């Protein structure tokens, strides 16, 4: 079946692009998604998101053994349903810092400066909270303050205050380089509001949009230097105008390589026929890494066991109580060196502990390396389109990353030692060992660090002439006509924020690049 545009992947970016491109009734748009409809309860309920790990809603990737982590493999959940990862994520809308775009503008020009992207980002947002927030007030994605924050969360913010991190008046993504805040949420009335909710669903009555679920794309079909369609298991979808890969940091890169687009020698070694030499495909992989500082609680921890009759009754009646929590209720930003300037550390407050020793009754500060120097890549394991690719982030390959995380763990410890928090905790929650000496701390970081689910950069944007660029500033794959990538893969440098915002923004930006308004 024949379309004008074939979009692969109904995720953060792909939902936006399907909705936007189908706004013109004279173009026919296909949105092709490996997963099914987002129908399960645990998709809707903020507190339930982590229960989707290892389910049909999750691709369930893992990294290769990581030398920087002592040989550990790291689990890589990815959403596999309408809305993609926006349907399984932790609902945090934490859109990053204006300076994050300096390396994008360096790579791809003023099209990708902050001034250019800002309206697209603000345009995605509909803030439901108090005035003075930085967020937009008219976009498809409802952004809300928490309905029922844990009582300890105010204490975390007070502790931050005591340690010189003041509360941000606009929320994260404001002018303040340093500070703390309640997490802005992708929630409407206490339930998830995903890209499928905000963008896709309103568009699905359109006669010119076909949403095709349950279909993993195997490769892009190339003919005479142009993408002509995509191959599913049993049939081909044709595109008269463009194929747009929105399959994310894993899937977009894997699909390029499976199509013969990438480094010819490596593709040959994986059993794939090279078609377009583009060595940057799968390279420049970046991700946030976090270490959880977990303490045993001396107070009630509702989020340790949120799914109870009482909480279900309150959620049903009022959409309040623990089930309305995304768990990661507050954030703080700082520099390891204590300077002014853009943050290189984030602290995430979760009033729970992943610790069986205390039955979950603990409190966590996740310490986040926002600007890793480590880099990795994704390659094919072989030519089977159903096989997972080989994911090697190179976590903690750079020793500076270890030192930065060590500094952040010291700061988290400082917070738990603060007047506002120390009364709430009594020792560490195993397997967090609590305070250790300097050398021990470096080893502990390597033993405990894990993904924070923000992988980017495998289909990096850049100007013609930049040998490891994958797409151009208009998101067109270099050396192919009628083929674009629009998702988190194109990001040159991992931001100082959580990447759902960036993916949505790229979706919006891509739609305007492909079909300018007016
Ligand atoms: C568990 C988890 C928690 C997270 N928490 C947050 C958070 O709270 N806040 C935040 O800002 N970010 C968070 N993130 C990250 C954020 O959700 C992602 O970075 C963002 O959604 C990526 O958008 P995307 O469009 O690039 O890809 P995705 O949204 O992953 O979309 C890719 C889509 O393509 C589909 N696909 C892939 N390959 C194929 C194929 N071959 N054929 C067909 N379809 C295919 C996938 O199934 C998926 O639906 C989280 C991520 C995860 C996994």
Author numbering: 3 to 520
Paper lines:
In both proteins, the FAD-binding domain consists of a five-stranded parallel β-sheet interrupted by a three-stranded antiparallel β-sheet that connects with two antiparallel β-strands, along with seven α-helices.
Interestingly, both structures have a substrate analogue molecule bound in the active-site cavity, with the site being highly accessible. In contrast, bacterial structures lack this protruding α-helix and the equivalent loops (compressing residues 353–364 and 356–379 in ShAAO and SdAAO, respectively) adopt a conformation that does not cover the entrance to the channel to the same extent as PeAAO does, creating wide and unblocked active sites, especially in SdAAO structure. Thus, the surface areas covering the access channel and active-site pocket were established to be approximately 2026 Å2 for SdAAO and 1383 Å2 for ShAAO considerably higher than the 903 Å2 estimated for PeAAO. While SdAAO demonstrated a scope similar to that of previously reported fungal AAOs, ShAAO exhibited distinctive substrate tolerance, displaying a preference for long-chain aliphatic and aromatic allylic alcohols. ShAAO exhibited the highest relative activities towards aliphatic-polyunsaturated primary alcohols with conjugated double bonds, 2,4-hexadien-1-ol (100%) and 3,7-dimethyl-2,6-octadien-1-ol (92%), followed by 3-phenyl-2-propen-1-ol alcohol (cinnamyl alcohol, 88%). However, ShAAO showed the highest turnover number with 2,4-hexadien-1-ol followed by cinnamyl alcohol and 3,7-dimethyl-2,6-octadien-1-ol (kcat values of 1050, 212, and 134 min−1, respectively).
